[PDB]
RNA sequence: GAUGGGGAAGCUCCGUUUCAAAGGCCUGAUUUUAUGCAGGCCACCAUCGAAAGGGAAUCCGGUUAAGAUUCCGGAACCUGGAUAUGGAUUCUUCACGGUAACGUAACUGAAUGUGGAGACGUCGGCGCGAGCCCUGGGAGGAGUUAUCUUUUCUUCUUAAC
RNA sequence: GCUUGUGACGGCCCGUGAAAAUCCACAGGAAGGAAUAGUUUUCAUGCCAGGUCGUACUGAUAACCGCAGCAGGUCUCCAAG
RNA sequence: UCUAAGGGUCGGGUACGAUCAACUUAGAACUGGUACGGACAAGGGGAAUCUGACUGUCUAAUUAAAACAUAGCAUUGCGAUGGUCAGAAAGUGAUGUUGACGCAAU
């Protein structure tokens, strides 16, 4: 239903309580005109909503995935 | 261009009723269709519908007329008795 | 034989009237302490069409000297009366088209629409568009007040009885021809189902007192008493002469 | 194929011809379509001004 | 080419049986069913449709803030703000003239 | 004579505060490099001090007497000059053309005006002022 | 079409707010206790009558021998009920800002009053959206190929929220 | 372009083209409320619940009505070149 | 098989150029067993007499007409304690959410 930029504010929906699971979705995607890209989408699972994060830098792409709470069941793929 | 010598708006019955309802008719036709000076805001914008009724296109004022025209001749002269005898009720 | 045409409208079944889309009963304020008092004043909210009705109504609106609140009547719009304007109804009130008045109050000559026939009945005569009625005098012991009425009639009526300023808005609509058949229909599709009308002179002998014969003819004079019977009277009833009239009307 | 020779200009004559020519094309539309040409050439010759607002007045209505 | 049916019993096109035609994620086309269109509310005097305030259905609007409900001044999603300039004016000359006739007719109970 | 000068009492006719009465602290009378326009600084009543009787004792009273004020900068146009008028000494210090900018200037300004208005009250002291302007 | 009524030998007929002592909500007063009294209201007078009128809220994909806006999967929304956490607000108690139209994540509001929505004919041309139709390039598959055709057909989609 | 939706306008009327449930807002200011800390669930997030009956198929030159698998009758939506 | 006419989009200091997308209309050649709205599709026309003005209506299942209706014209009744009509009766009912520019009857 929603999506999210602040990259702080991801972190603290991972950590409400009611979030059981995330998921993290990998996709080949075009950088402007020319060679493609790899993006990747964060989705947290609300009770009532579904945010997802694009993050479509592939640096901050992983330095956040382990961020991600211990406790967290994420969904790989 | 004149399109029509005579039957003006009347035109759109044809041939039917016969020419002196016709006529009847289009005096009372160009009489409720006609725009009106408005009283209040002094614009030409007091046109009818519904017979009896005009209203102004702006300033939104509606005033009580006749039928097909928005002073009848009766309610004038009613309008200047009235006149009459309230100003005797005054001096 | 049947029973005849005029018979069956009595009992209301496709003949009631077709009432769905009018704005109300058309009445004059409740005859009460400000009114018979004072006066009253209010704001016509609104005029506007009523379905099956030649004349425009009137939204007027009132306070309520009682409660707090706003009590909305509706009248019979005037000639010349228009939204906005401020409407005084009561004995005290002032002589202008649109205010409400016991005919007691008025000058002879006044122009007076919706008067009621005893005061308080919140109105009655001369409410068909383009009517009025006219005061041609007062009698102040046993207080009354004659009118003429748009019958030609004249008639006396209490001095207290009411009446509205001016004549009633829509006038001159009669002038007007129908042209065609659809627009009669029209019109009588918003009043009642009295229309088209079978002359009874092309009936059977079973359905009307002019029906049969081997030629359309009404067979026995149309003119049928006024102590006649119900199925009889279909004719020119009680009529006290017949024939084109020639020479002026205008009761003397 | 035939619509091409149709852009071409064929098979449009006197004898391939139905509807009249108002409902081949009707009148209202070609007024309404020159008429818009006409009414904004004046719009832009004015907002140059290679045309003043007095000249344009006039056309509009000559228009 | 694809045609299309009614997503529910009711076969007539009345009024709150409007349909429209959808390009599914599947790739066929598929009918819905349209909620007749909402209209803006209106003002009590004039009788504008008054700006600033949501147009909506009328039970949606108790699932709306407030503020989609009102604009700021008094009678604020009510009159059309036109409509309240003249209403201030109008009570305050009608109250101050008011006072002007208690001051001249209580000149004329002293003088007469 | 010009009478929109320090003392002149108005209503405000239109934004947020139409309605509600007001006392020029300065005016403007043309231009502005912003504002360009003729208008006005106005100290005005927001919440008004609601009806008291012998019924209200004790510090009800001082409840329904507090006074929410405004200040506001406004265009001639939406002000109606009153014949009434309220003076200015008080606040004149207070209301600037740089009390604006910088809220916490504004807050400080209303702070004095409010201290101002609800002296002028109690004293029952230009009335008027004080009662809302029903519409 | 019941009801206080009024007719009628009577089956029943009339009347529908009508000549009637016509009813119930918000809370307080209880800390013998469970709910009497305390105010103030509101005087609306049954009910039945629409699977085309009015009307709270769901979508796509998948699945069956036979069900699907109902199942499965995913993603929403509405109504009712509870409620805590964050934010907002207040020492000027019940927000600020914009000249203004107005703005915004909030931004106390009983009685009573009022305003809007619900909520509305028909036809005409003009404007725009959607789906369809037409069509260029390219990426695939298929058809024709004695001869001719960079060709003929088809795939290239995106729901509510 | 076609079907449809919709807007701003215009023609028409002695025709001027339903009702109620329901929802919201405003005017009002009754009252209740902070500094040793009160008010706020029309802002966000979060918890629970959502009953009863219909739901197959035909809708017609064979699933309805015409004694019938009758050339009759029987309301409507989608619509390619 | 040709010709001409009819448009859109841009930059111009305070006369034009440039590109893109449309069937419509008229005129000219050539051409054929003189054919060509080539199938489909698609009004017979004229002069009068009788009769109804017109559009509209009816005998389902032998009569669609010149019959009924209609606008138009004229007549009648009635101011409510009423006119016309309903009911066995009624604290009953239709016209009537009405009032003579109205309702009712011919
Ligand atoms: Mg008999
Ligand atoms: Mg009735
Ligand atoms: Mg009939
Ligand atoms: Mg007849
Ligand atoms: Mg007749
Ligand atoms: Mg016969
Ligand atoms: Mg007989
Ligand atoms: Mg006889
Ligand atoms: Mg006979
Ligand atoms: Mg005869
Ligand atoms: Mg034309
Ligand atoms: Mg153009
Ligand atoms: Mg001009
Ligand atoms: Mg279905
Ligand atoms: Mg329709
Ligand atoms: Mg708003
Ligand atoms: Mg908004
Ligand atoms: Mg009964
Ligand atoms: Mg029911
Ligand atoms: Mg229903
Ligand atoms: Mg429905
Ligand atoms: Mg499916
Ligand atoms: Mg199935
Ligand atoms: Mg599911
Ligand atoms: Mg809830
Ligand atoms: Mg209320
Ligand atoms: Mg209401
Ligand atoms: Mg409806
Ligand atoms: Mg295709
Ligand atoms: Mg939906
Ligand atoms: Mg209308
Ligand atoms: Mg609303
Ligand atoms: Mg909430
Ligand atoms: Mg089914
Ligand atoms: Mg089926
Ligand atoms: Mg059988
Ligand atoms: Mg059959
Ligand atoms: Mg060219
Ligand atoms: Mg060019
Ligand atoms: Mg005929
Ligand atoms: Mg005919
Ligand atoms: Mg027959
Ligand atoms: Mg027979
Ligand atoms: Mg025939
Ligand atoms: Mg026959
Ligand atoms: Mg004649
Ligand atoms: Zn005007």
Known sequence: ?77 | ?91 | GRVIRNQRKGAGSIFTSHTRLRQGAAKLRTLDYAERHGYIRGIVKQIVHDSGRGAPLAKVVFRDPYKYRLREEIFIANEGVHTGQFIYAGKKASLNVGNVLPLGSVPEGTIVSNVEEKPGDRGALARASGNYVIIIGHNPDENKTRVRLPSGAKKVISSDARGVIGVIAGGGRVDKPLLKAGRAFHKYRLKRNSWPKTRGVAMNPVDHPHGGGNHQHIGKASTISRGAVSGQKAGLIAARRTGLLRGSQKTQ | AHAQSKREGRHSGYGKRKGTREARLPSQVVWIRRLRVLRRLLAKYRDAGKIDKHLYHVLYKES | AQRVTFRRRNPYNTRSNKIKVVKTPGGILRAQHVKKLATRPKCGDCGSALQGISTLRPRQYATVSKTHKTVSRAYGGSRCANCVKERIIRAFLIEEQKIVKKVVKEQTEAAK | ?135
């Open chain 2, 1 to 91: 261009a004149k399109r029509t010598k005579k039957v003006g708006i009347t035109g759109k019955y044809g041939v039917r009723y016969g020419s002196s309802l016709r006529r009847q008719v289009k005096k009372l036709e160009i009489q409720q269709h006609a725009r009106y000076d408005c009283s209040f805001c002094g614009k030409k914008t007091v046109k009818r519908g519904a017979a009896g009724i005009w209203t102004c296109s702006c300033c939104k004022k509606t005033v009580a007329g006749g039928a097909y025209t928005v002073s009848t001749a009766a309610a004038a002269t009613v309008r200047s008795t009235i006149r009459r005898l309230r100003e005797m009720v005054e001096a």
């Open chain 6, 1 to 135: 004579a010009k009478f929109l000068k320090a003392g002149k009492v108005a209503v405000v006719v239109r934004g947020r505060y139409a309605g509600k009465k007001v006392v020029i602290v300065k005016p403007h009378d043309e231009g502005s490099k912003s504002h360009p326009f003729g208008h006005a600084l106005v100290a005005g009543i927001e919440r008004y001090p609601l009806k008291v009787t012998k019924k209200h004792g004790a510090k009800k009273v001082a409840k329904r007497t507090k006074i929410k004020p405004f200040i506001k900068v406004v265009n001639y146009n939406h002000l109606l000059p009153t014949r009434y008028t309220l003076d200015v000494e008080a606040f004149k210090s207070v209301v600037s053309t740089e009390t604006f900018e910088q809220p916490s200037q504004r807050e400080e300004a209303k702070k004095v005006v409010k201290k101002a208005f609800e002296e002028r009250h109690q004293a029952g002291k230009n009335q008027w002022f004080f009662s809302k302007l029903r519409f």
């Open chain 1, 1 to 77: 239903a929603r999506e999210i930029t602040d990259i702080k504010q991801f972190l603290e929906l991972t950590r409400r309580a009611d979030v059981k699971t995330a998921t993290v979705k990998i996709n080949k995607k075009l950088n402007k005109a020319g060679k493609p890209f790899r993006q990747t989408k964060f989705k947290v699972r609300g009770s009532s909503s579904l945010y997802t994060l694009v993050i479509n830098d592939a640096g901050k792409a992983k330095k956040l995935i382990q961020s991600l709470p211990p406790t967290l069941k994420v969904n790989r793929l």
